[PDB]
């Protein structure tokens, strides 16, 4: 699934970079760093409004 360094386009926050991935592969939790001033958001990958790249 998701990997550190991946870029994600989020419906709300635009494009950001994955800085942490945890939980098991079936319930990944992502930290995604969006450019200033949004900062880092922590969210469950399941049902997240994100697309890779």
Author numbering: 672 to 724
Excerpt from the publication:
The PcrA/UvrD helicase functions in multiple pathways that promote bacterial genome stability including the suppression of conflicts between replication and transcription and facilitating the repair of transcribed DNA. An interesting example is provided by the UvrD helicase (also annotated Helicase II, or PcrA in many Gram positive bacteria including Bacillus subtilis) which has been implicated in nucleotide excision repair (NER), mismatch repair, homologous recombination and rolling circle replication mechanisms. This multi-functionality is reflected in the ability of UvrD/PcrA to interact physically and functionally with many different partner proteins including UvrB, MutL, MutS, RecA and RepC/D. We and others have recently shown that PcrA/UvrD also interacts with RNA polymerase (RNAP), and this interaction could be important for the UvrD-dependent backtracking of stalled RNA polymerase. The extreme C-terminal region of PcrA/UvrD is important for interaction with both RNAP and UvrB. In this report, we define a small folded RNA polymerase interaction domain in Geobacillus stearothermophilus PcrA and have solved its structure at high resolution.
To test this idea, we designed a new shorter version of the PcrA CTD using the homology models as a guide. Crystals of PcrA-sCt (with the histidine tag removed) were obtained using the sitting drop vapor diffusion method. The structure was solved using a heavy atom derivative at a final resolution of 1.5 Å (Rfree = 22.2%). The final model includes all of the residues of the native PcrA sequence (W673 to V724) and an N-terminal glycine from the tag linker region. As predicted, the extreme C-terminal region of PcrA adopts a Tudor-like fold consisting of five anti-parallel beta strands that form a twisted β sheet. However, PcrA also features a charged lysine residue (K712) in this region. Several highly conserved residues cluster together on the surface of the PcrA Tudor fold that frequently forms a protein:protein interface in other systems. The pulldown assays revealed that each of the single mutant proteins had a severely reduced ability to bind to RNAP.
